[PDB]
Amino acid sequence: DTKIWNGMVGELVYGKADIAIAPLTITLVREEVIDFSKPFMSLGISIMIKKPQKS
Amino acid sequence: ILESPYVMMKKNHEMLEGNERYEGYCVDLAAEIAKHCGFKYKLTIVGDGKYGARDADTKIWNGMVGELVYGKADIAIAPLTITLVREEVIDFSKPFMSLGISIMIKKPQKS
Amino acid sequence: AFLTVERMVSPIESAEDLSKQTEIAYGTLDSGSTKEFFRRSKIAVFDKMWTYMRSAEPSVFVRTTAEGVARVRKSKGKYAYLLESTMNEYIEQRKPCDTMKVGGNLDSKGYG
Amino acid sequence: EPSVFVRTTAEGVARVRKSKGKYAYLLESTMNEYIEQRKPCDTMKVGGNLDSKGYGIATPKGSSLGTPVNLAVLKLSEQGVLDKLKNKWWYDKGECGAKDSGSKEKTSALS
Amino acid sequence: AFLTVERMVSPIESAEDLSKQTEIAYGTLDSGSTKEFFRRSKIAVFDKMWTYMRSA
Amino acid sequence: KPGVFSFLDPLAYEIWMCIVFAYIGVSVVLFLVS
Numbered sequence A: 001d002t003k004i005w006n007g008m009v010g011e012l013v014y015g016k017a018d019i020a021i022a023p024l025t026i027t028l029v030r031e032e033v034i035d036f037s038k039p040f041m042s043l044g045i046s047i048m049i050k051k052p053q054k055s
Numbered sequence B: 001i002l003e004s005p006y007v008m009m010k011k012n013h014e015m016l017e018g019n020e021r022y023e024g025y026c027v028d029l030a031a032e033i034a035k036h037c038g039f040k041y042k043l044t045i046v047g048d049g050k051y052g053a054r055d056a057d058t059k060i061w062n063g064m065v066g067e068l069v070y071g072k073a074d075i076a077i078a079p080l081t082i083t084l085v086r087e088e089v090i091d092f093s094k095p096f097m098s099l100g101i102s103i104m105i106k107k108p109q110k111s
Numbered sequence C: 001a002f003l004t005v006e007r008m009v010s011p012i013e014s015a016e017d018l019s020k021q022t023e024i025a026y027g028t029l030d031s032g033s034t035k036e037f038f039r040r041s042k043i044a045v046f047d048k049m050w051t052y053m054r055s056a057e058p059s060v061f062v063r064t065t066a067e068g069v070a071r072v073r074k075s076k077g078k079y080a081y082l083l084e085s086t087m088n089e090y091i092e093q094r095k096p097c098d099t100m101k102v103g104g105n106l107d108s109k110g111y112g
Numbered sequence D: 001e002p003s004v005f006v007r008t009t010a011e012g013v014a015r016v017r018k019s020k021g022k023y024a025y026l027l028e029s030t031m032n033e034y035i036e037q038r039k040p041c042d043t044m045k046v047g048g049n050l051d052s053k054g055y056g057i058a059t060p061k062g063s064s065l066g067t068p069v070n071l072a073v074l075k076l077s078e079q080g081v082l083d084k085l086k087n088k089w090w091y092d093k094g095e096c097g098a099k100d101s102g103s104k105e106k107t108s109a110l111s
Numbered sequence E: 001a002f003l004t005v006e007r008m009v010s011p012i013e014s015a016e017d018l019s020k021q022t023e024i025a026y027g028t029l030d031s032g033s034t035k036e037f038f039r040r041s042k043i044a045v046f047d048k049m050w051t052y053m054r055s056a
Numbered sequence F: 001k002p003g004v005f006s007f008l009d010p011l012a013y014e015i016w017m018c019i020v021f022a023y024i025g026v027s028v029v030l031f032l033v034s
C-alpha cells in the first residue's frame, strides 16, 4: 500500500542508517532498493528433529 | 570453458554450428540470461582453455579473465571461483551456486 | 521380528523422507519467507510438502520459532520442524542439546 | 609419502576407484556430486562443505550489462530455475539413480 | 532370510511403482499418441517416467 | 517349484561336503579314545 520500506531497509533507504551489518537475507526486491555486498555466509532451509538417544 | 556438465559438445557437434554446438548447465543458464536481459548471444570457448589466471610476471590475466581485461569476451559465464584478487580487476555478480570442498570416497562394500 | 523391524527403520536425511511418510508431522513458522518458498515452489517434492501442510490438521504452522522448538522437543520425534540452517546449528548447540539438524540445506541463501 | 597429491582430478578418480576404501580424495562439492551420478557409481560424497564458495557471473569492469545481469541472476535464483536446471544436468542426467540404485539391492546365498 | 526377502517383493499395481524403481525397464511405442501423452504430461509421476525414458 | 534343490539352497553344497568331511574327522577321534 504505502510502498514504504520499514526496518533496517527503511533505515538505509531513508538515510537513517549509514551501513547495515546483520543476518540480512538477500532478496531481489531488496536488491533494487539498496546495495548488498557479496554474501559472507551461505545458508538455507534446514531440518530440525529430536536427537535419537538410546535407552 | 569446457566443463561437464556445464558445457558439453553435441553427439553431432561436428554436424552442427553456432549455439547448436553447445549444451550444458551454463548453456541453459546463459539462455535464461538471454531471455531476461534480452539479447542475441553466441557462445565461444576460451582459447587457452583456462579460467584466466593472472601472470605474476607479465602481470597479465590470461584466459577468460584476460578476455574481460582486453574486451575479447563481452561477458563471462563459467564455473569460476570468485576471489578478492579477481574482483579488483573484473566485476563478479552475486554467486549463483554456493559450494565448497568435499570428501569423495568409494561407497563401502564389506564382506 | 523385533530386531528385523528395528533394523528396517531409518533416520530421515532428506525432506523427501517426510513426503514418503506421515508418522511424523512437519512444518514451518506460521508466517515468513520460508513458507512462501514452498508456496512458490515448483519442485514436485516441495510442492507435495506444501500441499500437505496446507491440508494437514491441526495445522503444522506455529506462531513463533520458540514455540516450534517446544513442539519438536515435546513431540518426542513425532514432529520435525524446518528453519534457517545457521539458526538450526545455533540452536543445536544450546541446552538441553536434545535436538539436532539433519541433512543438507534445501536451498541457497546468503547474508550480505 | 608417497604423496597424496595427484596431477589430475582424473588421477584422483583412478586412485579412489582403486583405493578400495584405503584412500579418500577431496574436491569441489558440485564436481563430487556430479561424479556420484557417473558410472560405475562406486563413488560417494560424505560430510558437509569445509568452506563456503560460490561461482558467479563475471563482467568486464564498468560494463553496462552488470546490474541487469545481477538482477537477472537473483530473479532466476528465486524462481528456483537454477535448482531446477541443477536437478536436470546432474540427477536427471544421472547415469545411476541414487534412490534407484538404492531400491535395487536384495540378494542372498551363503558364504 | 530367504522367506523374508521373498515376502518383501510385491507385484506392480501402479506406474508409480516403476517410477520408484529402475530394475525393470519400461516403455512405449517409438511413436504415437501414447508417447505424446507423456511428453506433454504435467503430472509429476508421468513426468518422472517420461523423463526417465527420455534418457534411459 | 524346485525339487530337492530348494532345501539345499540355503547352504551351499560345498559347505555340505565340508560338514560331512569334518564330521567324519570328528568321528574317528572318539575311537582314538577307545
Ligand SMILES: O=c1[nH]c2cc(C(F)(F)F)c(N3CCOCC3)cc2n(CP(=O)(O)O)c1=O
Residues within 6 Å of the ligand: A023, A024, A025, A026, C031, C032, C033, C034, C065, C083, C084, C087
Ligand atoms: O533478511 C532477513 N533475514 C532474516 C534473518 C533471520 C535470522 F535467522 F534470525 F537471522 C530471521 N529469523 C529466523 C529465525 O527466527 C528469528 C528470525 C528472519 C530474517 N528475515 C525475515 P523472513 O522473511 O521470515 O525470512 C529476513 O527478511
Ligand SMILES: O=c1[nH]c2cc(C(F)(F)F)c(N3CCOCC3)cc2n(CP(=O)(O)O)c1=O
Residues within 6 Å of the ligand: B003, B051, B079, B080, B081, B082, D009, D027, D028, D031
Ligand atoms: O575459478 C576457478 N573455477 C574452477 C572450476 C572448476 C570446475 F569445478 F571444474 F568447474 C575447477 N576444477 C575442479 C574439478 O577438476 C577440474 C577443474 C577448478 C577451478 N579453478 C581452479 P582453483 O584455483 O584450484 O580453484 C578456479 O580457479
